[PDB]
Ligand binder design. Structure first.
Ligand SMILES: CCCCCC/C=C\CCCCCCCCCC(=O)O[C@H](COC(=O)CCCCCCCCCCCCCCC)COP(=O)(O)OC[C@@H](O)CO
Ligand SMILES: CCCCCC/C=C\CCCCCCCCCC(=O)O[C@H](COC(=O)CCCCCCCCCCCCCCC)COP(=O)(O)OC[C@@H](O)CO
Ligand SMILES: CCCCCC/C=C\CCCCCCCCCC(=O)O[C@H](COC(=O)CCCCCCCCCCCCCCC)COP(=O)(O)OC[C@@H](O)CO
Ligand SMILES: CCCCCC/C=C\CCCCCCCCCC(=O)O[C@H](COC(=O)CCCCCCCCCCCCCCC)COP(=O)(O)OC[C@@H](O)CO
Ligand SMILES: CCCCCC/C=C\CCCCCCCCCC(=O)O[C@H](COC(=O)CCCCCCCCCCCCCCC)COP(=O)(O)OC[C@@H](O)CO
Ligand SMILES: CCCCCC/C=C\CCCCCCCCCC(=O)O[C@H](COC(=O)CCCCCCCCCCCCCCC)COP(=O)(O)OC[C@@H](O)CO
Ligand SMILES: CCCCCC/C=C\CCCCCCCCCC(=O)O[C@H](COC(=O)CCCCCCCCCCCCCCC)COP(=O)(O)OC[C@@H](O)CO
Ligand SMILES: CCCCCC/C=C\CCCCCCCCCC(=O)O[C@H](COC(=O)CCCCCCCCCCCCCCC)COP(=O)(O)OC[C@@H](O)CO
Ligand SMILES: CCCCCC/C=C\CCCCCCCCCC(=O)O[C@H](COC(=O)CCCCCCCCCCCCCCC)COP(=O)(O)OC[C@@H](O)CO
Ligand SMILES: COC(C)(C)C/C=C/C(C)=C/C=C/C(C)=C/C=C/C(C)=C/C=C/C=C(C)/C=C/C=C(C)/C=C/C=C(C)/C=C/CC(C)(C)OC
Ligand SMILES: COC(C)(C)C/C=C/C(C)=C/C=C/C(C)=C/C=C/C(C)=C/C=C/C=C(C)/C=C/C=C(C)/C=C/C=C(C)/C=C/CC(C)(C)OC
Ligand SMILES: COC(C)(C)C/C=C/C(C)=C/C=C/C(C)=C/C=C/C(C)=C/C=C/C=C(C)/C=C/C=C(C)/C=C/C=C(C)/C=C/CC(C)(C)OC
Ligand SMILES: COC(C)(C)C/C=C/C(C)=C/C=C/C(C)=C/C=C/C(C)=C/C=C/C=C(C)/C=C/C=C(C)/C=C/C=C(C)/C=C/CC(C)(C)OC
Lengths: 46, 49, 45, 49, 46, 47, 49, 49, 49, 49, 49, 49, 49, 49, 49, 49, 49, 46, 47, 46, 49, 46, 49, 45, 49, 49, 49, 46, 47
């Protein structure tokens, strides 16, 4: 699988991965904040 | 149509077009990335959905 | 375009800054937790 | 990602400002469309008073 | 892990880190300010 | 292909996989902690 | 598929941006037409409040 | 069918995009005229709700 | 019929497209003027429902 | 009748189409002004129904 | 002003202007002819008159 | 300023300007003549006056 | 009467048509302003019916 | 005016104009053909007529 | 009085017509703004009837 | 600045500018003359004043 | 009209036009493909139809 | 029928087919989801 | 015609048909499974 | 009837046939879906 | 005070008239915004009657 | 089946696969979130 | 910060005035959007009377 | 433009990724089915 | 920057700019002078103030 | 970038740009100065604040 | 693409583009900095939030 | 950490820091003025 | 890198750090004074 790095520029892949991860984490955290069960700062009670 | 040295009607060579388009795509991804976080904030904090 | 030693110098500055930044962040979060914990129980806070 | 040669026939001096300005125009139209067709977006402007 | 700076430019990464963490810190502080339990300026009961 | 040797690609891949596994391991521990707080898989009766 | 020679008499520097921009203009007009002639599209914006 | 030499005095680079765009504009105006002067065309947008 | 020399001073590349487009513009304006100032033309659009 | 030398300083390629088009624009504006400020001109459109 | 070979400011000779205007007049007559049948259809089948 | 051969800034000689303006005046008179009959028809068959 | 040298720095090919068209635009605007802010000017159009 | 080799003001020879107009006419027929089927669908499935 | 060298960098052919036209535009806007925001200016048009 | 032969940026000599402005002033006076009679007719036969 | 090396008025050879049009058609198909899925989502989750 | 691939570019035909199949499958699945009988995730009862 | 030999066209066609038959076979099985869930051909009385 | 391909281009005819029949088949299927007697997904009584 | 070299890349013949005209446009927009969103500014126009 | 990469470019196919499956996975997760039986964050009774 | 070579393909003479003017346009639109969709911003203009 | 061996290498990476991707996908669907089956019966879920 | 002979980008020498600006200022003062008398007439004979 | 003699793309040297910008800043300060007095008059004699 | 001396289509070298963009970014930061203080004033003294 | 100043222009860093500090101080002071507890000129009573 | 020697960069850094500590020291004293006026960390019962 190391041959992937000859095909694709390792710098551009890392930035694309980090950009995807940053966006995804923000999406998941704010989806949870909108929920009644997983909104931690909102004092959610089950 | 793979001549690095030819100057096309737009005034660019093919490598120059490829380099310019990469900034266009990178600009789009950053714009889309900020838009997605903007949308989830709109989902989380607006009556939408 | 970057030599091995120049990358060591960049990482040396990064490691010093990262250590101080995270160390202050950890202390800040310990203090914040002592003030008001942010993980609610079943009945809330 | 496949259309890098759009910039060989379209001049970037006209293609790029048109692209960026049009993207902004879309954003303004979407912002305006929601503003004029919701109550909460005007209410967000209105605030407590 | 010093090899990271042979891939990503340390010049841009530092600037992007300070701007990105500036935005993130403001977002988190403001999110806490918007809550009833962690708005330290309002000081509601916990 | 980009100007990367077989050895440089192999060296990047080993670090990439190691860094990925550390990122995942922290995430796995985080998810175990999150589960201990509130499980996110409801039963037949709901939450 | 048969009109590839439209680009021999129409300059792509003007034909292409006009085509893409006009296609987007059609999309905006269709979006706006439904927005101003339905209750559900404004209601989708409105959400729970 | 008889005016093939309209293109000997009118430049196709300006005649053709003007013609195609103007035809599309007529279509939008007809679509818009019916939309704003009927009840069924907005109702087709509205659907069951 | 007497003005064939209008095309000796006015460039046909601009005179002809302007003339044809303007004639079409007149037709749209007359169509629109009747549409907005009658009941039967909107009723023709409306039909049985 | 005394201004034949207006065409020695103003290019007929632009002066003539501007003049004729503007004359038509005046006619449309007068037609529109009466249409929107009378009852009989709309009624002439309306006819027996 | 009857020189067949002179190229006037518009880029046309007099014979070319006469030929172009003939298509203009023939186009107008066909347009007027279709309009007249359109008008009588409007007279016969619309409340007008 | 009575040089038959001089080519003025507009691209016309004085005799060409005189000839062009004559068609302009003849066009205006025919337009005015038709307008006058149109006006008296408007007087005779419209509530005006 | 003192500004004859306005035409040494402003091209008459653009200064004159701009001047005449703008004067006409003022006249239309004054006509329109009175038409929309009086009852007698619309009544003059309306006449006896 | 039947010179196959002459390059007219538009930048086209007569055979090039004939070939271009053929695509214009073929484009119109296909457009008209799709329009006719669109109209009968509008007749069959809309309150029109 | 101190800006005489504005005309060394701004072309008078474009600066002067823009300046005069813009001044007239301000005058029309001020006239129109008062006309639409007073009762006495419309009443001046209205007169005794 | 009194050189009869110099050709200024507008493309005119000073005597040509003076002659052009004379038609402009004579044109204005005729326009103003007709306007004054139009105003007194408006005074005499309209509710104004 | 099958000369690979000729440079047409648009500034393109025939093979260049064919390659440009293929990106236009591929772009249209991708756009149409996304639109079709968008439409079925509109059918499935909106009151339309 | 193998002569079809000399006339048409095999790469462009595969893209067209795969694009058509992806569109068609999405159309069919969402048409089914809109039905009362075949909406599987909606808990459809016959 | 495109730059493909008789042999390459024959080789593509055999794989194309084989791949098509496998895609169809999976779809056929999927349709048999879907029929067992809920048939989509109503009778005279409906569903 | 092989002489047809000396008049009409077999290259364009095949592509136009597949696209034209694609539109035609979708139209007929959708027309049947819009009926009460032939909407197999709705399954009204016949 | 630091941007004196904005005028090395932006032509003053277009940068300066745009700047001054845009500043005036802002002033008109602010004047108009207050005029349409207050009672006292129209009342200042209205005066004692 | 390795011959596929002599027809389609493996460079573009991989990128299109990751983006296409990213969109597909988000669509399916969000569709499930919109249901009442499979919204694991809401946790309705099954 | 990474886009410094946007100015190698987009002319600053057009990129810079467009950028600054468009930024101002956004500010006016945001100001206007709040002004027309709040009560306090018009009330700020209104003041004590 | 692609040699036979280079296509083998591309397919080798593809097969490894496809196997892992589908293998995780299959395990995910078994777990999802154990949680809440998504094929309703005649009376629903 | 006091060279009487240099021809600046606008096409003017410094003395030509000074003479042009003098007419601009003299034009402004006459305009301001007429405006002031217009304003006092507005003060004296309109409800303003 | 401190060459007094280089002629930059805008057509100005650096000293000419500095001198031009000084008039721009001095103009801005005078405009701002008059605005500030205008604002305080607005504060003092209008209901604002 | 790191040639200090090459003159790109925009008319700038790379060092000139870097220097120009630095003023653009410094301009944006100052604008954003002023906006942030403006926003907090809007937060502190307007009903918003 | 002194090597930071060879990478970044010390003048531009000082301007960015001073600009950031000036903006931040205005933000904090006016946030406090909006509060009921920390508005000093408003005569805030606890 | 910018045209700064190791010695100039070291000289700037020492002054920068000294200036930062003085700025922070004033801020720390300001915060101690502000705390004496009104603490900004509420207790469990609020303010
Ligand atoms: C620098 C960053 C520093 C930030 C650190 C925050 C880490 C999480 C906070 C610590 C949580 C400790 C347990 C909280 C707790 O005390 O919750 C208890 C149960 O939680 C339990 O078992 C355990 C529940 C743990 C909370 C859930 C944590 C999920 C996320 C973990 C971290 C994710 C990111 C990791 C990145 C390194 C009960 O709640 P009570 O209030 O008693 O009910 C009344
Ligand atoms: C609405 C809210 C958001 C809007 C934000 C802004 C959006 C759009 C604004 C306009 C976009 C920028 C247009 C710049 C066009 C000029 C750029 C240019 O420089 O194009 C040049 C020519 O452009 C030419 O003729 C053509 C010049 C005219 C182009 C006009 C395009 C139509 C107007 C824009 C329409 C946008 C959509 C509608 C918005 C209401 C060519 O470049 P060079 O290779 O240097 O050639 C040198 C030669 O020209 C020298 O003689
Ligand atoms: C509305 C919501 C969505 C809108 C999105 C955007 C849509 C449309 C915006 C405009 C579309 C792009 C127009 C670009 C035109 C300039 C391109 C160009 O570059 O065209 C050049 C000339 O164009 C010329 O004169 C003529 C240049 C003027 C063209 C103006 C066309 C009319 C404006 C567009 C109308 C669109 C429909 C109406 C929308 C309200 C020719 O190209 P080159 O071979 O380099 O020649 C070099 C020479 O010109 C140098 O002297
Ligand atoms: C509204 C909803 C549907 C609308 C869809 C789109 C409809 C219309 C958009 C505009 C139509 C296309 C206009 C293309 C004009 C540029 C084409 C062109 O390229 O024309 C060129 C010059 O055109 C020139 O000056 C003149 C260029 C200016 C032409 C502008 C025409 C007026 C604007 C269009 C009006 C349409 C009707 C009103 C709709 C609102 C000449 O061609 P070439 O042989 O290369 O010469 C090379 C030289 O120019 C180099 O110096
Ligand atoms: C509204 C509903 C129906 C509308 C349908 C469409 C109607 C009108 C659209 C516009 C009509 C076509 C305009 C085409 C103008 C360009 C044609 C052209 O090509 O004109 C060329 C120059 O035009 C030039 O400058 C000047 C080019 C600009 C001309 C713009 C005219 C004003 C805009 C049209 C106004 C129409 C009325 C208002 C409608 C709202 C001259 O031709 P050539 O001999 O090749 O010279 C070669 C040189 O140019 C090379 O440098
Ligand atoms: C509204 C309802 C009724 C309307 C009916 C139509 C009325 C008006 C439409 C426009 C009138 C025709 C305009 C034609 C202008 C182009 C003619 C032309 O060809 O003018 C040319 C240049 O025009 C140039 O710059 C200038 C080109 C731009 C001129 C556009 C003027 C503004 C638009 C007209 C405004 C009319 C009033 C407002 C109506 C909305 C010069 O001519 P030539 O000697 O060949 O020189 C050759 C050189 O140009 C080659 O480089
Ligand atoms: C509204 C109701 C009544 C309206 C009635 C009509 C009023 C106005 C219509 C427009 C007025 C006439 C405009 C004609 C401009 C072109 C004349 C011309 O010919 O100007 C030429 C260039 O103009 C150029 O660029 C510039 C050409 C563009 C000028 C456009 C000016 C702005 C549009 C007019 C605005 C009027 C006010 C607002 C109206 C709503 C220069 O002349 P020459 O010495 O031959 O140079 C030859 C060279 O150009 C060849 O390359
Ligand atoms: C609204 C209420 C208040 C309004 C007040 C007025 C405000 C704005 C009006 C327009 C502002 C002035 C525009 C002047 C532009 C022409 C100046 C000029 O002269 O620009 C020249 C070319 O500009 C070119 O083509 C291209 C020039 C394009 C200019 C058009 C810009 C868009 C229109 C203005 C938009 C303003 C904002 C919107 C307002 C509603 C370059 O200058 P030179 O070095 O001599 O080059 C010589 C060559 O051109 C010879 O071929
Ligand atoms: C990685 C992807 C992995 C995804 C796998 C999903 C495959 C389908 C799920 C398996 C279904 C097994 C039976 C379901 C069932 O239990 O349904 C039972 C009847 O099923 C029956 O006969 C048979 C029911 C079959 C269900 C319909 C399946 C149609 C689609 C099959 C797969 C299509 C795509 C294939 C591509 C490889 C009865 O329902 P109960 O709830 O008892 O009623 C109370
Ligand atoms: C040598 O030269 C050669 C021969 C080569 C060139 C010759 C060329 C040729 C053959 C040229 C042909 C020229 C033509 C055909 C000229 C035609 C001229 C025409 C038709 C002139 C017509 C003029 C009509 C005019 C000017 C009417 C003007 C009306 C006005 C100004 C009305 C204004 C009304 C107002 C302001 C009312 C407003 C009231 C309300 C509120 C109703 O308006 C909205
Ligand atoms: C050699 O050449 C080289 C290779 C160098 C040049 C190559 C260049 C490249 C890479 C070019 C790339 C080209 C691209 C990306 C092309 C993309 C083309 C696309 C996206 C085409 C999409 C087309 C979509 C179309 C045409 C849709 C048309 C829709 C229409 C006409 C709808 C009309 C609807 C109406 C009239 C309805 C009106 C109803 C209401 C009232 C609602 O509307 C207001
Ligand atoms: C050597 O050079 C030679 C001599 C060859 C060239 C010489 C040429 C010649 C003879 C040139 C002649 C030049 C002329 C005739 C110049 C005339 C200049 C004039 C008439 C200047 C007049 C200026 C008037 C001005 C600038 C008035 C400005 C008013 C302003 C800015 C008002 C703004 C009002 C606002 C924003 C109010 C808004 C409130 C409401 C809401 C009511 O507005 C809508
Ligand atoms: C070598 O080169 C030399 C040095 C010779 C050339 C150097 C020249 C110089 C000195 C150049 C100077 C350049 C300057 C002064 C640059 C200044 C740049 C500035 C001021 C940038 C400011 C940027 C601000 C931005 C980009 C703001 C963007 C805001 C956006 C996109 C907001 C969008 C908001 C939306 C879409 C919201 C819509 C909601 C509602 C409905 C309310 O909107 C209508």
């Amino acid at each position: 699988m190391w041959r992937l790095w000859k095909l694709y520029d390792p710098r551009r892949v890392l930035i694309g991965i980090f950009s995807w991860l940053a966006v995804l984490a923000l999406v998941i955290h704010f989806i949870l904040l909108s929920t009644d069960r997983f909104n931690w700062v909102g004092g959610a009670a089950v | 149509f793979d001549d690095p040295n030819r100057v096309w009607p737009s005034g660019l060579t093919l490598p120059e077009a490829e380099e310019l388009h990469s900034y266009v795509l990178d600009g789009a991804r950053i714009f889309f990335g900020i838009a997605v976080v903007a949308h989830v904030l709109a989902f989380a904090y607006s009556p939408w959905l | 375009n970057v030599s091995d030693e120049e990358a060591k110098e960049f990482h040396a500055m990064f490691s010093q800054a990262f250590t101080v930044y995270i160390g202050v962040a950890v202390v800040a979060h310990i203090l914040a937790w002592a003030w008001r914990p942010w993980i609610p129980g079943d009945e809330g806070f | 990602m496949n259309q890098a040669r759009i910039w060989l026939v379209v001049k970037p001096s006209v293609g790029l400002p048109l692209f960026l300005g049009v993207v902004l125009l879309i954003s303004l139209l979407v912002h305006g469309a929601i503003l004029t067709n919701t109550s909460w977006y005007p209410a967000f402007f209105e605030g407590n008073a | 892990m010093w090899r990271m700076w042979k891939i990503l430019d340390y010049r841009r990464t530092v600037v992007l880190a300070h701007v990105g963490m500036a935005v993130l810190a403001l977002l988190i502080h403001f999110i806490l300010l918007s809550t009833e339990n962690f708005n330290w300026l309002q000081g509601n009961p916990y | 292909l980009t100007g990367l040797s077989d050895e440089e690609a192999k060296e990047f891949h080993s670090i990439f996989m190691q860094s990925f596994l550390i990122f995942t391991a922290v995430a796995v521990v985080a998810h175990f902690l999150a589960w201990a707080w509130r499980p996110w898989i409801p039963g037949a009766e709901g939450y």
